[PDB]
Design a protein around this ligand. Structure first.
Ligand code: NOJ
Ligand code: NOJ
Ligand code: NOJ
Lengths: 440, 440, 440
């Protein structure tokens, strides 16, 4: 499983539209559910929103220059659906499409392959007003949007990702209400999860109809579950958390079914129509895998919707998010996914870490982020050397940005953003990543 | 046979002088046999000629910049003998030599290693008027020209190629008359083949006399032969086609003899003088291998000079040239050459494909050329992983150019040339090649 | 030993402060022992000195541009102790610190990792006036200087080297008197060797106290010894020369003891205080290995301090220094060092060769330097493929420079320096090294 001649590996960085673009009410853009959600008192730390963010809508040439300087071969970005179709379905916003044309063409001029993500959580509010992902029609609206983007951009862009982290859009957005649109209802979360996955499948078929050379995948985040206890009920807690976070989304895509143990525990029906599971399980060219941390759980008969709770394990390394740092879990997750779901290949579409950064003498020295990055790259390559088909790695993120309900206080960039001036300052982790790209 | 530490691989692009330079009657250049041949009604499609071509004589800085942008480490180009010695033998044209000085120095400033080919078919007409390659003296004229080029440029240029594709210069130029100088006579083709190969050997010795650190090879195109029939006579047809196309030129270089079955079938004498076969078979640092397609043949008792004919096999993928696409033959050819001729190392000095390209919105999306390139690189690395010493790959061609008797209608570039404006437009295949160079 | 996914390799070039900087009495710099030594007639060939050298203090941006052009990932340089602390201990010289800040920041802007060496022989004369390395306090002065440099620069610089080639500073500087400070006394050489090594250990501990992520090593030159004789006394000569050159410095660092056979043969006491050997042998992240040549010796009962003499072996290839070229010794040395001393990893911090160069038509063609470089890189990778953990290679040197007692007459650069104009001219070896960096 050692390197052989001709083998390739792609190095990238990742962002998303609402987190960096700004220009939220400029260039014809319509509001997203995160514009609305960010206006709710208490929804986002410090009352932050994405109105300006990193002003990447105006500063994209600088950010593209930083990518070329890093030496990445690829740039994972998302298209803001409400920027290009403000009404969700209907007329294209030519000014919005022109922005992505300039972004794409600028990347290609610099030798960077853009990897578009079609849905990274910024659903048009116009479609939320019709029920959003609770409405089955939203899967079809998404597929039509996806087709239009492929028709516009696939002459240049050959590697597509449909949706990003349906776990967050479905469960965090519709069951726990801590992400847009902020709904708290199990049935709604179930419906949303099915329509996100159906949208993925319909969009995949729509993209392939544009051209047979195009590649398509989905990005799923996986959160491996462990328990500190030995009781059978604590082992059940691990099984339930794994089903809720991981198998609920992986099983439809790769096995054409929902995990029966979770379906039974929910006691609700997934709104599956004829043809849905064939569409959701349509073959993919790759899995986009997001990994950051493992969760520690224990049984809790009182917890809902499933009888387990999170545990904060003692004496473990944690990031500024409070997330456990455990790179060995990354290796084991990659091996598990390859055996369980057998994706043709895997791209790490996100991995990274957030820490308290300080600017000293105009510079940012972030050794904790360097250490996380080094150890997780090592863990990834450990899996690749065992035969897991990992074809590339995208660092989350190129720049500090709007970290959803945490706002701007949580910095994931390898490049620092001073939001007072929009100055970009490469951190120590940027120089480390630059070296790794060149010298591997 | 996997990668080991220290192993190297060279990525390049290839062109030739008459096909790109233009400035055919500028800078003191004298006419070549292709200037003459292109003036004959019916000799070249659409009446095309190389008077202007890609105007690389003036635009070489842009083309070198495109090479740096692609990331190639090497540039295979040819020196126009009639630009540097218009009378074929005698005085150097200082203006022509200064052009190659500027080209070479510009490549080196950009980190690109130029690989000069001394003869890529543009014999000075002054020498054709004395018999060209039919005249034994032409081997010596070529060797003197080669010595002068090494004396001028080998302070910088360490890797030389003498001649390119003697199959074309000898048989297509002097037996079939479809390439310059347009002669149609078997004995003349035999004489030309021997004097091309003798010129190669004399030039190799002359270059090594300039400096012992210099490396020298020859570029041969090989066209593997198959048959769809099972008869013994169709198997004989394969042997005859292989002998005519491949062994006629490979056997003198690597085995110091002409293939006896073809000599006997011709019924003519090769004009071999004392010392010739030792000179032709002088040890080489590498073979430059050109590969594009395999030929399908069958026996034909009426055919001349040998009793076989070409067959257009049914239901196979073909390029815009009508050439079969069969990358597995590339792997098998590389393995066979390594066993049969055992060159110290192999450089793919040409491989590529031509398709009808369309400019849409100022861009050129050429998925069929991308696919050919991907599959032939895969096939080449398959041979390298079996132990074949392939040390580099040069894509034919950087830019669309004058495709000999096909004229400009046949486009081999990974960069499109709009001949009305001389604009260069990178095709999808350019972005693919750029990625492969970086990420392998 | 199987190249695997994730393995890295660092390509660099090396210089040192006194050899390139110039500006010896500018920018607040205080004199070093080499400023003083170079003023003594007969100490340096042609009366050369480092007053101007390559004027890199003023031309560093040009030199950094040349490094970026070569494509190196790393730049090994030394900090001039008397430029940053002119009195050796005490006040920092802000102008000197600012120079290294600009150098470091310029390298990082270009994607180059600076590798600082803290002591490359330019001891402040103010400290020599107090006994220099003969004075135990010099080990502590060095450690305090090292701590201040890490405090200033380790926000950016993570890989440190303490001292370079104590063989030269101790034996050539204090026993043979052919390098600064020009002393000729065995006991002084022994004292100096101990305080250099103690300084290394104290500085390593001081650097690690600044930040636990910092890496530290030492650079040792090793000169493998052979004999042409078969007698038992000539085999003893090999053991003595190996002990004098190599084990005297390697054994303290990696085995916490001085080689007992050499201690006995000297018959002198090393000024070891309790605790010193634990300090000297403090664990290192890597060994910086310098290799240029092997020595041939024979027994000589009359020789001092040890009964052997150098032999000039007949009929071997030699550089312009008179040094034997024998790349196989490099492979065997790397294997031996890894087996006997087991450094966690090895960086080749210096290897290279000097030849008489000639400028012809504004260019420098140096095939003998190319050949040495090619063969020693091959020999290094042979050791890596046997499992030796060689993580990078730094060519000595980026530019021609002041070759100590040989002056400017001995040119080690892959880039030529015309000292009349300070023009930099890349040699053939620069283009070769550029290719190796890209294509390996
Ligand atoms: O939480 C960090 C990172 N993980 C997942 C999301 O895709 C991304 O937008 C977010 O910023
Ligand atoms: O036919 C394509 C290509 N192959 C052979 C020749 O070397 C080159 O000049 C030509 O353009
Ligand atoms: O002698 C060549 C080279 N060897 C070792 C020294 O570190 C360096 O300064 C010197 O120039």
């Amino acid at each position: 499983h050692m390197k052989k001649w001709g083998d390739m590996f792609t190095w990238g960085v990742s962002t998303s539209s609402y987190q960096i673009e700004g220009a939220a009410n400029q260039g014809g853009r319509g509001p997203s559910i995160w514009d609305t959600f960010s206006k709710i008192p208490g929804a986002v730390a410090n009352g932050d929103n994405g109105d300006v963010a990193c002003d990447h809508y105006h500063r994209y040439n600088e950010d593209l220059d930083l990518m070329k300087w890093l030496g990445v071969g690829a740039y994972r970005f998302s298209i803001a659906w409400p920027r290009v179709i403000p009404s969700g379905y209907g007329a294209l916003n030519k000014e919005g499409m022109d922005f992505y044309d300039r972004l794409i063409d600028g990347a290609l001029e610099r030798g960077i392959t853009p990897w578009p993500t079609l849905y990274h959580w910024d659903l048009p509010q116009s479609l939320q007003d019709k029920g959003g992902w609770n409405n089955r029609d939203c899967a079809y609206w998404f597929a039509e949007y996806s087709q239009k983007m492929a028709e516009a951009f696939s002459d240049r862009l050959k590697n597509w990702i449909t949706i990003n982290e349906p776990f967050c859009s479905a469960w965090l957005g519709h069951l726990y209400g801590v992400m847009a649109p902020g709904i708290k209802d199990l049935k709604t979360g179930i419906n949303a999860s099915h329509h996100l996955l159906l949208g993925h499948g319909l969009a995949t078929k729509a993209i392939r109809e544009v051209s047979s050379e195009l590649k398509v995948g989905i990005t799923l985040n996986f959160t491996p579950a462990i328990t500190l206890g030995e009781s059978s009920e604590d082992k059940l807690a691990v099984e339930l958390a794994d089903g809720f976070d991981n198998r609920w989304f992986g099983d439809p895509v790769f096995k054409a079914k929902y995990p029966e143990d979770i379906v039974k525990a929910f006691g609700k029906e997934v709104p599956i129509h004829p043809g849905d599971m064939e569409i959701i399980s349509t073959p993919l060219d790759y899995l986009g895998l997001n990994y950051y941390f493992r969760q520690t759980v224990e049984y809790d008969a009182t917890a809902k919707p499933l009888p387990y709770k999170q545990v904060t394990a003692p004496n473990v390394e944690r990031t500024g998010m409070g997330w456990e740092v455990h790179a060995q879990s990354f290796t084991e997750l990659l091996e598990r996914v390859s055996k369980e779901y057998k994706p043709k290949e895997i791209f790490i579409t996100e991995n990274g870490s957030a820490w308290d950064d300080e600017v000293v003498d105009g510079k940012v020295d972030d050794p904790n982020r360097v250490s996380y990055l080094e150890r997780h790259l090592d863990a990834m390559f450990a899996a690749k050397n065992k035969g897991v088909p990992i074809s590339g790695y995208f660092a989350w993120s190129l720049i500090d940005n709007f970290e959803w309900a945490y706002g701007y206080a949580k910095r994931f960039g390898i490049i620092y953003v001073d939001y007072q001036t929009q100055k970009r300052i490469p951190k120590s982790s940027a120089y480390y990543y630059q070296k790794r790209i060149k010298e591997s």
